[PDB]
Point group: C4
Chain length 219, copies 4
């Protein structure tokens, strides 16, 4: 009974059938943001959403039947599973973010449509080499998050009152977002010398990113 | 009678002549932005323009006999066509904006100088390779924009009330422009976990971008 | 019994563990950020803090007896030395800014983990190459800061009132932080030609940067 | 006479002495930043200045004899000539800006130090191969600056009343500086489609720039 379906899955028609559905649901999903649309035609779309979700679930099972254990070591396939499984919990008691997460299902376009997968693959592939600098930056940020909560969090709770807040604010400055008129000049009206931790924090932070990118190019 | 024209149109005087006209027009088009200039010299310029549009109009018709079906298979020539074209379409009819669109005709200086066109060509030529990254990034933006409108549009209709607006703000965060104190910090005052939405978004979008340059460089 | 003591601190059991105390101190220090936590658990960590500082002190002393003159020509241990020493400076010198500098010893995880060291050292190696770039820039900065102070200082004391202040604003404009709406537009209301100063400045600082990166790549 | 004068100017003593003098006049002008310093030592620094311009006028004179007409074919010296010459034009009456342009003489540290000469010349060296893109981009800016003024200049004069104003504003958007909340969102409150102008625009300027940098790198 294996042989019957295995021929169905590998067909030009199975894949193209799934892909045409995704691009369709993605067009559907666009229209789902207009509440006005959701009046005049709202009923069609909860249905369409239930149908596609059913089809995909069936479709994942056959592929596991066909691929067995070789399915759960293909990351692209694992993602489609995790992206499909996610899309199935009822949106009531569970966080209502999952009603919003189900648009991730459009990322199935990447997994099933070639060219798209490689680019993601090329990109993911620079990540393991970098994990160390990522560990560095995170330890670095953390040492500085601690310093900032203690140095400025008393008088400036919105920016530095909590360790998590300190991370964020600190993150903004690295992204160079309104950082001087916005955060430190305020800081200097009380702390004339905050530039001693924000001007160098900025140098380091800039220095590493630039050197990281450079290190990508050489490699 | 068909045989006579080709030797005129192809001459190095022809090409030298048209480029001169573009530069004079471009000087005059600068002048048209000045009000003072207009009372004082308005009427010379409004008429100079239609003489130039005809001369260009004459050149294109002529160029089509010599180059035949292959005229319209030339991308450089097609631009030439539509740009003088748009300067021919009447004012009240269609839009009113295209009257002002006319300034685009200074871009003929690019079409007609071999040195400019090759840079442009070289520039255009990285793109067929980018069409994967454009496609990929457009798909990614689309997906987060849908999530953002539904997450954030009822309480912030100005910013996310709508898909377009959702796109717009997301392009903006991507350019890192006042992204935090100006969009996300406010957001965070009603929706605290918005940093989970935008800080990841920021990483992804700036990462994809950086790596795009490396493969441009290497290739 | 020399080599026996030497046997001890060079062991893999000792270091990973004291690395683990770093990881441990790193955790409690995050915890010290909470006023809630500090209230009902303050003595656990006021306690946890004293043991660790002591342990680190014996290690530094010991590693010296093992290495002697060699200890003090190792850049990573001098760092190690100085950041424990700082913690051996008491609570107050009026400047209780030092009690905050204590959390600097968490950079010891960098000194203590060879894979960390590899990354930092790679990063440093970039710098000497740029010492030439650094002097030219600091000079241009020095002069223009002077022109700025004299030019804008009387009417705009916050921004340019002072050599140091013009330095800060100039650094800000160089990071391209709200440079237009935030500084130059206001200035031109009093001094309409200020664009003749700052756009050239921007031009140079952007330019040199770009060029800075290119040098890094080749090096 | 000729050879006797010619042999002191070319010496390691002459130029070291001038460099030594330049560093003081640079240190001296920073002190002139402090009106505090000026009411307490201003008489010391007002003539230290005065004899330095004397010495430099003389130094310049000697160097002219040694190199004759070939002096005015040297970029660094012609620079030295005018940059000192400027400080000799009388402050009073005709114009008072000329007093501040006098500070440019501190740029001679570059002129007189060969490492500095090496750096600058290297920098200038990348410019000739960039000019063509300067031409295209400047031509693009010139086209859109015309457009922004006719399109947005009526209702928004501060930003677009004048070409220079559209240039400056486009340059800002180019510098990507507070462009959405600061510029285009307001435009959009009257002209909802203003983004069809500005969003493509940002794509272009960012694209050309990267590829400009990239073109630099590979060679
Ligand atoms: C995420 O961390 C970052 C932290 C910091 C920066 C530098 C940001 N930059 C100052 C903003 C625009 C500046 C730029 C130049 N200058 C530019 C970009 C696009 C168009 C024109 C220009 Br003039 C360019 C080199 C990124 C980038 C980061 O990611 C890319
Ligand atoms: Ca920025
Ligand atoms: Ca900014
Ligand atoms: Ca800003």
């Amino acid at each position: 009974m294996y042989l019957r379906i295995t021929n169905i899955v590998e067909s030009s028609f199975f894949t193209k059938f799934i892909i045409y559905l995704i691009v369709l649901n993605g067009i559907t999903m666009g229209l789902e943001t207009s509440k006005t649309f959701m009046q005049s035609f709202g009923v069609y779309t909860t249905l369409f959403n239930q149908i596609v979700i059913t089809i995909f679930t069936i479709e994942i099972i056959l592929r596991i039947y066909v691929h067995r254990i070789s399915f759960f070591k293909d990351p692209w396939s694992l993602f489609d599973f995790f992206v499909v499984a996610i899309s199935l919990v009822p949106t009531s008691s569970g966080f209502e973010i999952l009603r919003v997460l189900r648009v991730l299902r459009l990322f199935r376009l990447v997994t099933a449509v070639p060219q798209m997968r490689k680019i993601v693959s090329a990109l993911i592939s620079v990540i393991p080499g970098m994990l160390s600098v990522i560990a560095l930056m995170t330890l670095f940020f953390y040492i500085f998050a601690i310093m900032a909560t203690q140095l400025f969090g008393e008088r400036f709770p919105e920016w530095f009152g909590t360790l998590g807040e300190s991370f964020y604010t600190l993150f903004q400055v690295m992204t160079l977002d309104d950082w001087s008129n916005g955060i430190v000049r305020p800081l200097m009206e009380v702390y004339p010398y905050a530039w001693v931790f924000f001007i160098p924090f900025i140098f380091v932070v800039t220095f590493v990113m630039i050197n990281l990118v450079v290190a990508i190019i050489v490699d």
